[PDB]
Amino acid sequence: SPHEHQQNLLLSRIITNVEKLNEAIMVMNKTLQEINIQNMNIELVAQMFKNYQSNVLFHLEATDNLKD
Amino acid sequence: AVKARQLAHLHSQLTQLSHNLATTENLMRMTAVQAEAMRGLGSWHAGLFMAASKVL
Amino acid sequence: SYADCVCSLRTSLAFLESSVATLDNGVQDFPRLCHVLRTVRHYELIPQTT
């Protein structure tokens, strides 16, 4: 019985920490979701310069390349 | 009352667990791809400025 | 109760391990470039023509 009271009280502070933790995590995921939208643009441009480098390399190798 | 609170804790745990794991897996894989994209991007621009230095 | 707790918590930690593991495989190369660009960071600009 007294042990149970102690356990219930510790469980109460536990549950409060649980809810606070998860609320912060909700904010975390929400933040990342909003961020995500501001990343696809950059990703596209990254792949654009990537394939640019790839294709220009292939063509330079085709012509008189001037590498090492 | 006692087990009602036990399962209240469990339901909160599992609920937010599913949420957190969704967050975790999806955004982690996404950001890993984003990271490698930014890697190649910055490296290309770095070499661009390197060649500019040699142009000087 | 405890069964759901241990199973779910174990899965949670497993997915966290997966998260960090893939992040190791996909981000571990950054410090090299970070050190590089830290060495490159010496910037100062005064437009003489302006």
Binding site: Q53, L60, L66, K67 | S43, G47, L48, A51 | -
Partner: peptide, 18 residues
């Protein structure tokens, strides 16, 4: 562009020094 490619390959090289 040529030297930029060379520099990029050097940048992504796991080994590099100042």
């Amino acid at each position: 562009l040529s030297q930029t490619e060379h520099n990029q390959r050097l940048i992504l090289n796991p080994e590099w020094k100042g």
